[PDB]
Amino acid sequence: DRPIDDIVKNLLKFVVRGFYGGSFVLVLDAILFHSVLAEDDLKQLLSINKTELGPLIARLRSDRLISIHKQREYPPNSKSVERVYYYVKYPHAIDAIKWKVHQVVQRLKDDLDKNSEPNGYMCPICLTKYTQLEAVQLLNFDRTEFLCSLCDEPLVEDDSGKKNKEKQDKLNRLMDQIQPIIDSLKKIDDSRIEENTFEIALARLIPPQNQSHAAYTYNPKKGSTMFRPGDSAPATLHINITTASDEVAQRELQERQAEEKRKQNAVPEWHKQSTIGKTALGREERENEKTLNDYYAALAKKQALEDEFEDV
């Protein structure tokens, strides 16, 4: 696993744990621990109902923290069934997280800017908001009180005068709490991530169950030109050791090869000599060594399931 993969996994875990409930953490942690995970395998792993799993998967799919992949599987001894797999498309998830973080921060900043503006006015009866400029044109002839148009009743000053500090405190808190995501996004931007696909994710699969009914394989149909929205992404060494006998044999073989080479380039017998007079063509030392060894020893003592298969 690459360090960038670890970084993005940590970012996803933090986002899920901080901005989602507990069951969301369970589901996404399961799908992060494993590769593409079947619906039945996920249900068995987390021991949660289909109805409970529904909202979690739906919310994670809406936030694009989890991608879906439906394919038709044909068991050898059962009716085929369209199985649903869940995985994480890191580029899409990162983009969604970045956009949502930016939007939240921008919303709080805009709320602070709006609150810094004057209060306004409200009508207690019709519950209508009037800006300062809109209320300035509705005052009574006595120049004493602002009167509503529909109700002809005095207006009441709006709230939010004292929240000026509260919104700033909220922003200060949020930035500190959201600090980790920013650093993870910085590292992610420094690095480059490759988009994930069902087949690619299957390469890192850890089987959930011994006999999971889902077939975790990707067998695309042959010559299928159909395109669905958002379904595409951008020797042997041998060593030989020689001995003295092999050395003499090798020189002998080289001599034989040289003889064969000279024979190959040699002129034929008929061309070598003028063949005019020929008929026309048509239809013991061992005991000596032993006594030597004995004598030297005496001297020393004196001094001292059938289918296609390819071979590879």
Partner 1 sequence: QFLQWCTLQPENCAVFTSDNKEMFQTESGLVVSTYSMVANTRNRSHDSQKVMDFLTGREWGFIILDEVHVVPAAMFRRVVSTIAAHAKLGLTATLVREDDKIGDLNFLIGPKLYEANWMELSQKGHIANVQCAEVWCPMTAEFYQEYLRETARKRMLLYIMNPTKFQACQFLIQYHERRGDKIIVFSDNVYALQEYALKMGKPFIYGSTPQQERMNILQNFQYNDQINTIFLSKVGDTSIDLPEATCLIQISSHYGSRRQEAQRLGRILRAKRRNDEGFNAFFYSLVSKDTQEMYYSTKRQAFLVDQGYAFKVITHLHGMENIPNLAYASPRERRELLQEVLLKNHPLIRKMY
Partner 2 sequence: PRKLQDLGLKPASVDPATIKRQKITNTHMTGILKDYSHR
Exactly one of 104, 175, 233, 253 binds partner 2 (CB under 8 A); that residue is 233
CB 17 within 8 A of CB 189: no
Which 72-131 positions form the footprint of partner 2 (CB under 8 A)? Answer: 91-92, 94-95, 98-99, 102
Binding flag, residue 6, partner 2 (CB under 8 A): no
Q: Is 283 in the site for partner 1 (CB under 8 A)?
A: yes
Q: Which is nearer to Zn ion, 150 or 244 (CB)?
A: 150
CB 219, min distance to partner 2, A = 19
As a whole number of angstroms, the distance between CA 48 and CA 53 comes to 7
Nearest to 41 by CA among 62, 27, 56: 27
Query: Per CB under 5 A, which region of 57-65, 119-127, 170-178, 272-280 contacts Zn ion?
Result: 119-127
Query: Cα separation of 100 and 106, whole Å?
Result: 10
Give the Å distances, CA to CA, from 166 to 98, 109, 118, 169. 25, 12, 16, 5
Q: Which one of Zn ion, partner 2, partner 1, none interacts with residue 283, CB within 5 to 8 A by kind?
A: partner 1
- Positions in 250-279 near partner 1 (CB under 8 A): 262, 264-271, 274-279
Judge whether 61 and 68 are in contact, CB under 8 Å: yes
Q: Find the helix packing angle between 39-46 and 50-62, rounded to 10°.
A: 120
- 188 contacts partner 2 (rule: CB under 8 A): yes
Enter the tokens of residue 252.
Answer: 């002998």
CA–CA separation, 238 and 129 (whole Å): 89
Please tell me the count of residues contacting partner 1 according to CB under 8 A. 19
**Binding residues for Zn ion (CB under 5 A):** 123, 125-126, 148, 150-151
**Binding residues for partner 2 (CB under 8 A):** 91-92, 94-95, 98-99, 102, 188-189, 193, 195, 227, 229-234
**Binding residues for partner 1 (CB under 8 A):** 262, 264-271, 274-283
